[PDB]
Design a protein around this ligand. Structure first.
Ligand SMILES: OC[C@H]1O[C@H](O[C@@H]2[C@@H](O)[C@@H](O)O[C@H](CO)[C@H]2O)[C@H](O)[C@@H](O)[C@@H]1O
Length: 190
């Protein structure tokens, strides 16, 4: 079936950990394209199913891939509008707070410099960061800083305290954050 219209705006998505997956809404991740761009999901930490995610979008929002340090993703763009970078981060090993902090940049712009997945949600579960963007005339505007766009969007995260962001669920869509379906809890019988 097909009702939602999210897949209609998708343009590029990557979940470091699994291998080519399509979330319910219809958001597909393209197999390890930056981790040596060669190999297959090691699926070593497939265990511990994320709670805030349905079984299918679970393996996606979950799974884990390890590179080495300062991992970098490339998102070639050729259109404008409101680009919304949504990503699901999960797991990090060791139950500690304000210690395992990392850095996250968009097209070279630090938006979350203190990514402590644990302190953020707590238990494993699923973590999510929403970063709306505005590209016009070929230029880029991140939050409150202006910088022209050049070839592609680059999400680079730098090491903070060993073990770079374990689980990565990169998901980039185009045109707006409002599209992102969100059904508020409903009681009774549907
Ligand atoms: O190859 C499996 C995992 O290796 C690394 O994790 C290490 C862990 O297994 C243990 O031995 O402790 C060390 C020190 O912190 C960890 O580095 C990778 O970080 C992980 O991504 C792999 O799945």
């Amino acid at each position: 079936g097909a009702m939602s219209g999210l897949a209609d705006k998708v343009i590029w998505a990557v979940n470091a950990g699994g291998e080519s997956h399509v979330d319910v809404h219809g958001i597909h991740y393209r197999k390890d394209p930056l981790e040596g761009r060669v190999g297959r999901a090691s699926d070593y930490g497939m265990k511990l199913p994320i709670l805030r995610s349905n079984p299918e979008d679970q393996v996606l929002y979950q799974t884990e891939r390890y590179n080495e340090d300062s991992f970098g993703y490339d998102i070639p763009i050729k259109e404008e509008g409101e680009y919304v970078l949504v990503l699901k981060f999960a797991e990090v090993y060791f139950a500690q707070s304000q210690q395992k902090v990392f850095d996250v940049r968009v097209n070279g712009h630090t938006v979350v410099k203190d990514l402590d997945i644990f302190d953020r949600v707590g238990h494993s579960t699923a973590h999510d960061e929403i970063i709306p963007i505005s590209i016009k005339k070929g230029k880029l505007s991140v939050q409150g800083e202006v910088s022209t766009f050049t070839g592609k969007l680059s999400v680079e995260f730098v090491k903070g305290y060993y073990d770079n962001p374990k689980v990565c669920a990169l998901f980039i869509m185009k045109g707006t954050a409002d599209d992102v379906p969100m059904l508020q809890p409903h009681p009774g019988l549907e």
